[PDB]
Design a binder for this molecule. Structure first.
Ligand SMILES: CNS(=O)(=O)Nc1nccc(Cc2c(C)c3ccc(Oc4ncccc4F)cc3oc2=O)c1F
Ligand SMILES: CNS(=O)(=O)Nc1nccc(Cc2c(C)c3ccc(Oc4ncccc4F)cc3oc2=O)c1F
Ligand SMILES: Nc1ncnc2c1ncn2[C@@H]1O[C@H](COP(=O)(O)OP(=O)(O)NP(=O)(O)O)[C@@H](O)[C@H]1O
Ligand SMILES: Nc1ncnc2c1ncn2[C@@H]1O[C@H](COP(=O)(O)OP(=O)(O)NP(=O)(O)O)[C@@H](O)[C@H]1O
Ligand SMILES: [Mg+2]
Ligand SMILES: [Mg+2]
Lengths: 294, 263, 267, 299
């Protein structure tokens, strides 16, 4: 599952090579190009010529904590996978933490959903494989879960790649950012139970229902949403539209009990994944056609 | 009236971040529907009603270019930055004095039917390490005979200082004097523990759910042994889950003054 | 801004009381039960001037009480007036502190004039050093708001302290001799007190003689008594603000500019 | 002194023997006699002695050392005992105000008397002149002190017919402290004191003559002019004179000799005491007490 084909291995080696040309990141080395959303800018690193995405985070914390966050963020230099957004570096300037990462010209699947209305099932089958493989990579190779899986944190590009981003690689940053109108949190995490990658699987199933039906599928204020997640049954795909294997896939992702919920190994050999993995789908074509790219 | 000509105000540094300036000395300035004019009017109308040493001094408003509100420039740091960033070591009598001055300004606000609605240690400035200044009235409002008629929007601030009924948003207008008191009680918790509440919870939605459901509340065992028992009761009374059981600021002032005369 | 009299407690008399209204306050109450129509207009004009001031170097107006006796409520400053520090307690200020007091006073005066407020009673006693740190200009019982017809109306006789009155205000040869420059002169005498530790005309102990000799231009503050520490730019500023000719005196925007420049390069 | 004067001066000192350390809590207000530029005067009752006093209060913001020097310098008033000088009981400090307790004159000052009477007849003013000249002589001969503030408000009278001076410069530190005052309305300063040249009791004589004119004609004779214009008139314009044929030629020569602008050419206390107006006035048997009591309302 963490084995790369020839094309993915060459793409990963090429990214590392381009990453070699990048040295110490300074605020002056960057030129703002546009705003991708929020804050995150599409920027240019003048010494290297590389296009990057620069996320800025403002925190009022002790300087020692800020430095440890920068040290914990360095672990992203080891997170190299076809299903993980690449990382260039992270630094501090003007009171804001700058996280500089691979630029994804397709944006987030939250953005793709707005331009598509709803995302087809075969496309979502390729998305499910990517998220599952990305969650597997993080667990097997780095012993961390994601903690914030949702459509805005699944990025895509015109090469057909699908990658996770904004996972909890820095414990100090997780604690600092504990201070959104929707929510993709699992029931067990809302109630203060200990949690695992199982809660990411719930978050993925919830995101799949949203992208499939083109609607956030809960129900309204934030508390009533969280009350609905904990005390009401999970959502489900409509019965007539989507295949039975896709319906069973999300249902096993949305079981409220995390132990009875399916794990990554179960999901990887699920019939919905077997079928979508064998299907030849032109994701890059669909993406560029859906967004209006070249 | 209180309008300032835009040509006079100078900006220097940077509803956003900082904006230090210079208009007859150091000042602080702020960065489009009829709703946002109501936002300017409500903040300006509240500010225009305040003339108290523990309330940030409103100085004037502007309209040209981008809308602006001009206030005094406080020298020093915010209570948040004093407690959680710089770890300024205050003696217990200084902590009780900060608690008193804050209650003094809040009592002045409520006496004029002002609900701050966004009280937190980030909005309490320690002017020269001496005088508490309550600021950031962007979410403030005056209590009126149609306040319950209007549907408020979600505070979208920090959940740590929001009262449980403000989190639940089950009523049209959960804000009140007692919701300000709860926020003040959390500020007391910061003063009398040195920590923010819910240190063990690193999940915003978990705080929203458990505090809204009553399943979570500040850990009173984290209060200093240096903290008088009357002060400990005052914190507990101010963060009561039941709105009506929370004392009002006249009671807060009486309680602090008694334990201060004691010391 | 009217305050209900039940809410205010009067604790200590110093008429002025240290009171309690949402904390310590100062309450200046006029103890007269038959308020003359002149006492009325005086109360309303002082309230009207205070109503226009929102600045850190102006004593904070908080409200007025009309029921019972007329009264004005302000913040309670902790400390002493500049007169008390300089001439009674003889506080030993450093030169940079003295210059900082000069700067903060010019700051508040520059705010007042920008709102067309003539103080008309600027003196050491009406400057309060709150917390030892911050200047608070107070006592607006003689203050007026400049208007179109203000400069041409015949004001009543001056009744304030002679040591700080501009020569044209003493002479009363104009209908209204007050202006921005007369406040500047009074401020200059405050500068003279800061930079010498003494009042002007200490060799003249005759009240009427000071009136006559300042009015005629025969007497003026003795600039040779300025401290040795006092920077020359500060000495020239004292001399500029005290110039006998009205039009020669600088205005407070220039006063502030000069003191700020000197503070940037001072140890 | 005469027999009646010596008997009264001993009665004063005898009552003064019953007054000791003066404290604020022992005083009881009765009325407010008046309030001027420097301070305010009340009629008080010293409860231990049961006496009636006049408690002047002067507000001063001064160093504690300066206020004690003023209290020491005011003790010289214990030695100023004369029928033409107001008596002294004691001086102390309290609540930021120096309290000068002195003899109560139930007739008030000639300023109040002139306001009730309108004009003061020449025969009465003859008795007033004799009192002022003799008071100025006592202060210069027994204490080497000029008055420095002669005016109708500082000439006190009582129902017993006595006329006495008050509020004279006995304390050099009090004089310097009260020079930081507010702008006044009237002025009785001599021209030489206004211009800053040398001065003596000749300035008190100029003030007396001006005060005589004010009480005789019933109006302040300098000059509505401002305080500065009045000072220029005193310095640069000729002095005022009594009207043409309303008074005797002796009163006019006496006044005109008191108001000569040149102090050297101006009459002195010796010349004035032997002046025709004073010799005639000292011979008249005027009933000053009846005039005062019927004019004020005392009975
Ligand atoms: C809602 N769930 S939660 O309550 O658990 N909160 C949190 N969830 C998850 C994470 C965090 C903190 C955090 C964040 C936000 C973060 C963002 C970007 C980042 O850069 C890259 N990321 C991936 C690939 C390449 C990169 F360059 C690293 C980050 O690392 C972090 O640790 C949370 F606070
Ligand atoms: C306008 N002329 S000026 O400018 O020279 N000013 C001054 N003139 C004159 C004097 C002074 C100061 C002074 C004053 C005012 C004074 C007042 C009362 C007093 O009590 C009694 N007095 C007499 C008899 C009995 C008393 F109980 C003693 C006083 O002793 C004083 O020394 C001046 F400041
Ligand atoms: N590497 C990237 N390449 C392209 N677009 C990006 C990249 N990183 C972020 N973005 C975009 O920037 C937007 C803002 O990101 P972010 O600040 O994480 O908000 P978010 O994803 O919606 N999560 P949240 O902050 O909780 O609302 C995302 O929704 C993406 O569309
Ligand atoms: N010993 C006294 N007995 C009775 N009345 C007195 C006595 N001393 C003063 N007064 C009255 O109190 C008034 C106030 O006197 P004072 O405080 O000296 O001001 P003033 O002499 O009238 N004018 P000024 O010199 O400018 O302050 C006098 O005018 C008298 O009428
Ligand atoms: Mg994101
Ligand atoms: Mg007098």
């Amino acid at each position: 599952e963490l084995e790369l084909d020839e094309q993915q291995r060459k793409r990963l080696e090429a990214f590392l090579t381009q990453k070699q040309k990048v040295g110490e990141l300074k605020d002056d080395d960057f030129e703002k190009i546009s705003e991708l959303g929020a804050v995150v800018f599409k920027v240019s690193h003048k010494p290297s010529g590389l296009v990057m995405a620069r996320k800025l985070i403002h925190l009022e914390i002790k300087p020692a904590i800020r430095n440890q966050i920068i040290r914990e963020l360095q672990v992203l230099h080891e997170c190299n996978s076809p299903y993980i957004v690449g990382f260039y570096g992270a630094f501090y300037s003007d009171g804001e933490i700058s996280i500089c990462m691979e630029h994804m010209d397709g944006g987030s699947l939250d953005q793709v959903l707005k331009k598509a209305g709803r995302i087809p099932e075969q496309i979502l089958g390729k998305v499910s494989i990517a998220v599952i493989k990305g969650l597997t990579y993080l667990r097997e190779k780095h012993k961390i879960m994601h903690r914030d899986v949702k459509p805005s944190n699944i990025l895509v590009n015109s090469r057909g790649e699908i990658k996770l981003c904004d996972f909890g690689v820095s414990g100090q940053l997780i604690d600092a950012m504990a201070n959104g109108t929707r929510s993709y949190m699992s029931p067990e995490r809302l109630q203060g139970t200990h949690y695992s990658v199982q809660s990411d699987i719930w978050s993925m199933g919830l995101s799949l229902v949203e992208m499939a039906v083109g609607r956030y599928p809960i129900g309204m204020a934030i508390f009533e949403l969280l009350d609905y997640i904990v005390n009401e049954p999970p959502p489900k795909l409509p019965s007539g539209v989507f295949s039975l294997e896709f319906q069973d896939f999300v249902n096993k992702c949305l079981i409220k009990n995390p132990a009875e919920r399916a794990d990554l190994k179960q999901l990887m050999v699920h019939a919905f994944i077997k079928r979508s993995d064998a299907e030849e789908v032109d994701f890059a074509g669909w993406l560029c056609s859906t967004i209006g790219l070249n | 009236d209180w309008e300032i000509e835009a040509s006079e105000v100078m900006l220097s540094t940077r509803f956003g971040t900082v904006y230090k300036g210079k208009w007859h000395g150091d000042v602080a300035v702020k960065i489009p529907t009829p709703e946002q004019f109501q936002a300017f009017r409500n903040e300006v109308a509240v500010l225009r009603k305040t003339r108290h040493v523990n309330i940030l001094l409103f100085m004037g408003y502007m309209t040209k270019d981008n809308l602006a509100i001009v206030t005094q420039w406080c020298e020093g740091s915010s209570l948040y930055k004093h407690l959680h960033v710089q770890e300024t070591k205050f003696q217990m009598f200084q902590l009780i004095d900060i608690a008193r001055q804050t209650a003094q300004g809040m009592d002045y606000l409520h006496a004029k039917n002002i609900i701050h609605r966004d009280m937190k240690s980030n909005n309490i400035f320690l002017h020269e390490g001496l005088t508490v200044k309550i600021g950031d009235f962007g979410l403030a409002t005056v209590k009126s005979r149609w306040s319950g008629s209007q549907q408020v929007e979600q505070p979208t601030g920090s959940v740590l200082w929001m009262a449980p009924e403000v989190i639940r948003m089950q009523d049209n207008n959960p804000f009140s004097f007692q919701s300000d008191v709860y926020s003040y009680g959390i500020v007391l918790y910061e003063l009398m523990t040195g920590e923010l509440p819910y240190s063990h919870i690193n999940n915003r939605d978990q705080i929203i759910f458990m505090v809204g459901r009553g399943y979570a509340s500040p850990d009173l065992s984290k209060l200093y042994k240096n903290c008088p028992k009357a002060m400990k009761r005052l914190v507990a009374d101010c963060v009561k889950k039941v709105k009506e059981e929370r004392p009002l600021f006249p009671q807060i002032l009486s309680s602090i003054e008694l334990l201060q005369h004691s010391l």
